[PDB]
Amino acid sequence: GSHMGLRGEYYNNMDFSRFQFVRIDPCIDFDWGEGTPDQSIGKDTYSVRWTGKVEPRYSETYTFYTVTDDGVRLWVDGVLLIDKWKSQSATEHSEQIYLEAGKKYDIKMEYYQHVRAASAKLMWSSKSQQKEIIPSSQLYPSDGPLPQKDVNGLSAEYYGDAELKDKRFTRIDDAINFNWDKDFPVGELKDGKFSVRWVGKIDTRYTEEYTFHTVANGGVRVWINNVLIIDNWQNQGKEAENSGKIELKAGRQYDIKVEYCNYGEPAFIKLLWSSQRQKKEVVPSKNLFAD
Ligand SMILES: [Ca+2]
Ligand SMILES: [Ca+2]
């Protein structure tokens, strides 16, 4: 029965971002060694969500067990039974819940790999059920809404004043790398005065202290992880440079907000990053998510 199992959502980050593919796994019995579930998933920092329904054979006290590297969360019947979302070598965790023979219960298992070894196994036991891998005959995949690939770039609001007040249009900018060079991006302005807000998500290649850099002809603010790390909103200098630092982990998304105001100069703004292993560059569209 091709259809039996749970639906597995496979992401290339460890926080259920960078969605790659869905597939129906007949059971949760994976040992990926130091590798990945599929050639389309990169080594390290990945996550999997399995959802559907489990059907016990007996009306009894079930024990659910997870053996994972790294972390896990297990819901059965909307109860969070196991909450061990952490870095761990292969480790069993378990909890009990009372179920009724032949009833179909919601099950959701969230898993992630950080580094080194990766595995995920879901088992059950009861008075009459000898401890096994939960088999495909007792598991029904969810259907309903597939996950959506998010779009690269950031959601930009363009304003017809310098104070982020009069909103003219929204689009997705591939990156924050603009030399507008007197042809303002917004029409019908007074005194060349306009402003922009980019919102979305960013992820990094490396775990370490990043430095974000703005080069700008007007005022800038930058938030990363909802921390204000650049604040030069009054600036007028041509290609004025600001920097600010934040510690980030590879393999997960962080909020990003960038605000720009032009005070009538020919407009310019670039957002760069650097770190001990990241050489200074314009932050690339492939690390920016529009959400
Ligand atoms: Ca990854
Ligand atoms: Ca691991």
Which domain CATH number covers 274? 3.90.182.10
Considering the domain architecture, whether residues 40 and 73 belong to the same structural domain is answered as yes
The CA 112 to ligand 2 mean position distance, Å, reads 8
Ion ligand 2 neighbours, Cβ < 5 Å: 69-70, 113-114, 116
The CA 190 to ligand 2 mean position distance, Å, reads 56
- For the chain, the first-to-last Cα distance in angstroms comes to 36
The CA 35 to ligand 2 mean position distance, Å, reads 10
Domain boundary among 141, 170, 185: 141
From CA 290, how far away is CA 15, in angstroms rounded? 16
From CA 64, how far away is CA 30, in angstroms rounded? 16
Ramachandran sector of residue 148 (left: φ over 0; alpha: ψ -120 to 50; beta: rest):
beta
The CA 210 to ligand 1 mean position distance, Å, reads 18
- Which amino acid is present at 194? F
3-state secondary structure the chain: CCCCCEEEEEECCCCCCCEEEEEEECCCEEECCCCCCCCCCCCCCEEEEEEEEECCCCCEEEEEEEEEECCEEEEECCEEEEEECCCCCCEEEEEEEEECCCCCEEEEEEEEECCCCCEEEEEEECCCCCCEECCHHHEEECCCCCCCCCCECEEEEEECCCCCCCEEEEEEECCCEEECCCCCCCCCCECCEEEEEEEEEECCCCCEEEEEEEEECCEEEEEECCEEEEEECCCCCCCEEEEEEEEECCCCCEEEEEEEEEECCCCEEEEEEECCCCCCEECCHHHEECC
The CA 221 to ligand 1 mean position distance, Å, reads 29
Resolution in A: 2.1
Domain boundary among 141, 162, 181: 141
CB of 35 within 8 A of CB of 41? no
The CA 44 to ligand 1 mean position distance, Å, reads 5
The CA 193 to ligand 1 mean position distance, Å, reads 41
Tell how strand 132-133 and strand 119-125 pair up.
antiparallel
Considering the domain architecture, whether residues 131 and 215 belong to the same structural domain is answered as no
CB of 142 within 8 A of CB of 7? yes
Domain containing residue 161: 154-289
Q: Tokens standing for 212?
A: 């974000």
The CA 70 to ligand 1 mean position distance, Å, reads 13
Q: What angle do CA 94, 96, 101 make, to 5 degrees?
A: 125
Asked if residue 100 is part of any domain, the answer here is: yes
CB-facing half-sphere around the CA of 44: CA atoms within 13 A: 9
Asked if residue 148 is part of any domain, the answer here is: no
Other beta carbons within 10 Å of 212:
22
CB of 6 within 8 A of CB of 50? yes
- Where b means 16+ CB within 10 Å and e means fewer, 121-149 reads bbbbbbeebeeeebebebbbbbeeeebee
- Which amino acid is present at 51? T
Method underlying the structure: X-ray
From CA 81, how far away is CA 73, in angstroms rounded? 8
Considering the domain architecture, whether residues 216 and 171 belong to the same structural domain is answered as yes
From CA 252, how far away is CA 13, in angstroms rounded? 6
- Which amino acid is present at 84? K
Considering the domain architecture, whether residues 14 and 119 belong to the same structural domain is answered as yes
Query: Which ligand has the minimum distance to the alpha carbon of residue 14?
Result: 1
- Enumerate the β-bridge partners of residue 29: 121
Q: Which of 233, 181, 211 is nearest to 283 (CA)?
A: 211
Considering the domain architecture, whether residues 121 and 169 belong to the same structural domain is answered as no
Asked if residue 218 is part of any domain, the answer here is: yes
Query: Which ligand has the minimum distance to the alpha carbon of residue 41?
Result: 1
CB of 97 within 8 A of CB of 79? yes
Asked if residue 272 is part of any domain, the answer here is: yes
Considering the domain architecture, whether residues 162 and 127 belong to the same structural domain is answered as no
Q: Which residue has the tokens 């950031």?
A: 154
CB of 233 within 8 A of CB of 261? yes
CB of 140 within 8 A of CB of 55? yes
Other beta carbons within 10 Å of 257:
15
From CA 255, how far away is CA 17, in angstroms rounded? 12
Asked if residue 197 is part of any domain, the answer here is: yes
Query: Which ligand has the minimum distance to the alpha carbon of residue 112?
Result: 2
Q: Which residue has the tokens 């495909």?
A: 136
Considering the domain architecture, whether residues 280 and 192 belong to the same structural domain is answered as yes
Q: Give the number of residues written for the chain.
A: 291
The CA 68 to ligand 2 mean position distance, Å, reads 9
From CA 51, how far away is CA 141, in angstroms rounded? 6
Q: Which of 266, 212, 206 is nearest to 236 (CA)?
A: 266
The CA 264 to ligand 1 mean position distance, Å, reads 43
CB of 125 within 8 A of CB of 65? yes
Domain boundary among 141, 164, 198: 141
Considering the domain architecture, whether residues 276 and 170 belong to the same structural domain is answered as yes
Query: Which ligand has the minimum distance to the alpha carbon of residue 40?
Result: 1
Q: Tokens standing for 173?
A: 């900018």
The CA 13 to ligand 1 mean position distance, Å, reads 4
Query: Which ligand has the minimum distance to the alpha carbon of residue 35?
Result: 2
How many domains are there within the chain? Answer: 2
Q: Which of 43, 81, 48, 47 is nearest to 62 (CA)?
A: 81
Asked if residue 1 is part of any domain, the answer here is: no
Q: What angle do CA 66, 71, 77 make, to 5 degrees?
A: 50
From CA 42, how far away is CA 103, in angstroms rounded? 38
Considering the domain architecture, whether residues 50 and 96 belong to the same structural domain is answered as yes
Ion ligand 1 neighbours, Cβ < 5 Å: 12, 42, 45-46
From CA 220, how far away is CA 196, in angstroms rounded? 10
The CA 112 to ligand 1 mean position distance, Å, reads 10
Q: What angle do CA 215, 216, 220 make, to 5 degrees?
A: 105
Q: Tokens standing for 231?
A: 């604040």
CB-facing half-sphere around the CA of 42: CA atoms within 13 A: 11
Considering the domain architecture, whether residues 170 and 137 belong to the same structural domain is answered as no
